[PDB]
Structures are given as structure tokens and as C-alpha cells.
Amino acid sequence: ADTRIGVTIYKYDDNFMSVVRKAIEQDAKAAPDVQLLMNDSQNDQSKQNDQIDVLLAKGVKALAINLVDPAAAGTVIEKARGQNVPVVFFNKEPSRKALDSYDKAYYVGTDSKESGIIQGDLIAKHWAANQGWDLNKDGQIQFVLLKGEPGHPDAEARTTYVIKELNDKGIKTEQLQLDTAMWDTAQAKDKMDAWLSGPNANKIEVVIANNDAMAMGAVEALKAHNKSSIPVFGVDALPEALALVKSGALAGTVLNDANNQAKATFDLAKNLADGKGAADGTNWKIDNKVVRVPYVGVDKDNLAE
Numbered sequence: 001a002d003t004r005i006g007v008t009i010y011k012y013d014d015n016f017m018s019v020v021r022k023a024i025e026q027d028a029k030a031a032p033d034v035q036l037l038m039n040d041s042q043n044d045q046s047k048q049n050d051q052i053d054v055l056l057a058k059g060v061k062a063l064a065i066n067l068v069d070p071a072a073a074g075t076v077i078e079k080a081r082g083q084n085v086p087v088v089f090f091n092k093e094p095s096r097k098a099l100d101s102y103d104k105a106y107y108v109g110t111d112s113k114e115s116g117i118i119q120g121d122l123i124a125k126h127w128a129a130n131q132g133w134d135l136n137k138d139g140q141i142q143f144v145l146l147k148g149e150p151g152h153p154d155a156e157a158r159t160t161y162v163i164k165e166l167n168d169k170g171i172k173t174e175q176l177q178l179d180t181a182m183w184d185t186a187q188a189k190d191k192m193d194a195w196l197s198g199p200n201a202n203k204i205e206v207v208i209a210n211n212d213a214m215a216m217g218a219v220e221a222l223k224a225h226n227k228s229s230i231p232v233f234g235v236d237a238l239p240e241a242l243a244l245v246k247s248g249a250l251a252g253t254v255l256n257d258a259n260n261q262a263k264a265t266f267d268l269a270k271n272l273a274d275g276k277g278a279a280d281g282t283n284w285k286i287d288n289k290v291v292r293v294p295y296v297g298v299d300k301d302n303l304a305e
């Protein structure tokens, strides 16, 4: 009488989704009646699509899906609809229209813009406290920005809102470079290294990354160039990134709460598999089929708290 739930993780080597993957498996360990069928989609939506077909053929009673491509939500929903199986999307947010296209589709994640606002406020605080960072003394932050996947709601919101928030607080900004490194450490290292090796590299004052993995790559490129005096900011508060906040290699980050996103995803998926209301017997507040888990800013001043 075990209940099977199919789960896809877009890429197991994504630093953040690795934390989430492990947390959801710990949640499942505590539900002796449930079996998770865990899949690594290897950063390929076509691989994920085939994995979902296999999961459905195996009779799973719910799906928890971390999309490779957000725009593929519709495709995945139509697969789930064919079996009348509920689907809890997590971490890559489908459009409102996509969510509303199937009454058994839900989403667990975050308020993406909040992470951009928090990161921007963190940078504003550190900038005001470290006016030595204004290398050219023009009152503006000359920044470079390492973006996540184009079209990913967290990448778009974190990129828009970090700058909006700095500007709203009265801090002018000059974008010297902006490119995607696709959430990846090695790509970010190579991009940052190029920026440090190009003309007017001397003008760069602050590095902004949409996640910690990319921030960490930037930290390594700065080290290679003896330019570690330039501050770097990320998002996620990965343990490895918190170690760099401690050492001073990373100026700040933002907790993306993997534990509670994993728990909400599991709790809702299990309820839906059982034919119950998604939040039954839980304290999750579902707002129009969506659970959002707060972000929290982190730097040396609150690292212990």
C-alpha cells in the first residue's frame, strides 16, 4: 500500500538544487508509506520529458517537477493530465496561465523579487559603510552582474530588482558588464576572468551575482587577478558560501530556504497523491495554488543569527 511520487530535479549538479534534492529525500525517509522515485534530468528538458513518461507508466500518484525549461510547464501539465495526476512544480515557476491551465497544478518556491530587493539593500548598506569601494569617487557603483538562466524568474527578478533597489535608495549605478553564466561556477569564473582581462577592468567596483555558485566563480577569478579587494555578492547562503562570508571572500548573500521549500513540496505532493487538499494537516499557506518561502539577507553581522 505504498504511495509512489515521481520527482525530477533539473540538474543534480546545481549547487542549490542539490541541497533541495537531499532535503526532500530526508522528508521522504520520515514518511514510511511513501516512495519517492528521484530523477536527475541532466539539464535537458527532453530527458526530463522522457523521465516523466516513465514515472507515469510506473503509476506514480503525484509528480514533483523541477523544470529544466520553465516554458515547458505546459508540456509537462499535459502529460500529467493524461493520467489525471497532480503536479507540484518547484523552484522554476510556471506562468500564472500555465498554473491555471490544470486544477491539479501547484507551485512551491519563493517571491523572486524579494531576493533582489534584499540583495540590493545589503549592497546599499555595505557601500555606505565602505566608501573606499568607490574607486573613481563618482558616487556611483560601477558594477558587473553575473546573471542566471535567461527567462528564469529568479534570474530576471534578481537582476531587475537589485539595481532598482540600489537606485531607489539613492545609489546610482553604472552597468559595466552583464552576462549570463547559467547559474554555474565554472562559467562565472571564466566570464569574470574575461572582464578582469579586458580594457577598463580597472573601473569595476562591485560584483553582483544572481546566485552563490556564480559568485564563487567570480571570487576565484578575482583571486587569480589579485583583485579580491572588489566585493562580491550572491544569493542562496549555501554552506560553502557561508564559509566565504566568514573568511571575508564573499561580502554578502541571501538565504534561499531549501529546507522549507523541500518540505512544502513534499507535504503538498503527498497530500495530493492521497486525494486530499494540498495543505491538509499542515501550516502551509497556499495563495492561489502557490507556496512562497521567505528569503533572508546574510552577512558577517548576522552570520551567527
Ligand SMILES: OC[C@H]1O[C@@H](O)[C@H](O)[C@@H](O)[C@@H]1O
Residues within 6 Å of the ligand: 014, 015, 016, 017, 091, 092, 154, 183, 210, 211, 212, 213, 235, 236, 256
Ligand atoms: O533553478 C535553479 C536556480 O534556482 C535559484 O533559485 C537558485 O538561487 C540558484 O542557485 C539555482 O541555480
Ligand SMILES: [Ca+2]
Residues within 6 Å of the ligand: 134, 135, 136, 137, 138, 139, 140, 141, 142, 205
Ligand atoms: Ca564609482
